UniProtKB/Swiss-Prot annotation:
This is Leucine-specific-binding protein. Keywords: Amino-acid transport, Disulfide bond, Periplasm, Signal, Transport. InterPro entries: Leu-bd, Leu_Ile_Val-bd, Peripla_BP_I. GO terms for cellular component: ATP-binding cassette (ABC) transporter complex, substrate-binding subunit-containing; membrane; outer membrane-bounded periplasmic space. SUPFAM superfamilies: Periplasmic binding protein-like I (SSF53822). One of its GO terms (molecular function) is L-leucine binding. It is found in: Periplasm. This protein is a component of the leucine-specific transport system, which is one of the two periplasmic binding protein-dependent transport systems of the high-affinity transport of the branched-chain amino acids in E.coli. Belongs to the leucine-binding protein family. It comes from Escherichia coli (strain K12). It holds the Pfam family Peripla_BP_6. Disulfide bonds join 53-78.
């Protein structure tokens, strides 16, 4: 019979663009696996849920998935939506592989039914710090975040890395997501002579901050995590995007092995360049690999199978640890441009 797979992330709300990547990836993976035969003849059927990357809606989606009888979830997208959902999946015996959530705590609580194909901010944070310390070498640093699990997690991790090396972090502060007016913060960066800012959060805020910064003449170097590194960033920020630093996964679209899938997305006129197309595609491949190899429909048998034997995916040969995290997932540093391109820093 058909095998239902829930796919969960933002299809509404302020970061729906990251969701667009996720769904585009999941859909192409499901199509490709079904075109190749399915799972010994059984077709994968994607069942899509919008959690708006909102913790309360995520919980409602998780409860709906349980009620719907679905046993496998590729989701959720954001850390603060994925973690409360994971509590329900774990309790109910449902497999959950997140292609998006990077915050460490998800997989540090002993859970057995949870995995990711996303990286960890316990790696992303230190990488930013190292680059800041060793290459940027700033004089006066401010660290800003959006008071949310992902962004504040990362802002804390970078502060910790920088303060370990006695760097001059002048202040640490939160802003409210959705904020369109950064004139107060920007005046502070100017008056306090801040030449470097790290912002833990997502592109809508980062873009507005960059545009407003350059409009008053601030020359401050900004940096953020992969959450800011979107085609939207440069549209929102304008020429102010130029020079922004971002940590991001490898450019899987440039791997020659993916040229066929790149072409598939291109024939649909979908953008293939975002890392999360591939990271989601790889979660679907992972689940499919487990289903094919085990012949089991048990979530825990599928998770045991991936942790023992791995999967070959569009983001490379995958190996997971006993907590459900990928070994060897690294983030690189990139320099953004007004036209939305980016170069290795
Ligand atoms: N990694 C982010 C979500 C994210 C998904 C896709 C791209 C960028 C960011 C988090 O844990 O919330």
């Amino acid at each position: 019979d058909d095998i239902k797979v829930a796919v969960v992330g933002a299809m509404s709300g302020p970061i729906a663009q990251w969701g667009d990547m996720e769904f585009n990836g999941a859909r192409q993976a499901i199509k490709d696996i079904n075109a190749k035969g399915g799972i010994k003849g059984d077709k994968l059927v994607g069942v899509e849920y919008d959690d708006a990357c909102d913790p309360k809606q995520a919980v409602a989606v998780a409860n709906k998935i349980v009620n719907d009888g679905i046993k496998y979830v590729i989701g959720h997208l954001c850390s603060s939506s994925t973690q409360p959902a994971s509590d329900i999946y774990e309790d109910e015996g449902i497999l959950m592989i997140s292609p998006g959530a990077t915050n460490p705590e998800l997989t540090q609580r002993g859970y057995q039914h949870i995995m990711r194909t996303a990286g960890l901010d316990s790696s992303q944070g230190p990488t930013a710090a190292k680059y800041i310390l060793e290459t940027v070498k700033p004089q006066r640093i401010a660290i800003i975040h959006d008071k949310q699990q992902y962004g504040e997690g990362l802002a804390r991790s970078v502060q910790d890395g920088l303060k370990a090396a006695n760097a001059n972090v002048v202040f640490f502060d939160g802003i409210t997501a959705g904020e369109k007016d950064f004139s107060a913060l920007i005046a502070r960066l100017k008056k306090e002579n801040i030449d470097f800012v790290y912002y833990g959060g997502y592109y809508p805020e980062m873009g507005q901050m960059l545009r407003q910064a350059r409009s008053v003449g601030l020359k401050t170097q900004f940096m953020g995590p992969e959450g800011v590194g979107n085609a939207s960033l440069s549209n929102i920020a304008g020429d102010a995007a130029e020079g922004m630093l971002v940590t991001m996964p490898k450019r899987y679209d440039q791997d020659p092995a993916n040229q066929g899938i790149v072409d598939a997305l291109k024939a649909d006129k979908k953008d293939p360049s975002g890392p999360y197309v591939w990271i989601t595609y790889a979660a679907v491949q992972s689940l499919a690999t487990a289903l094919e190899r085990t012949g089991s429909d048990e979530p825990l048998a599928l998770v045991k199978d991936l942790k023992a034997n791995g999967a070959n995916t569009v983001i490379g040969p995958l190996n997971w640890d006993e907590k459900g995290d990928l070994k060897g997932f690294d983030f690189g540093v990139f320099q953004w441009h007004a036209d939305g391109s980016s170069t290795k820093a």
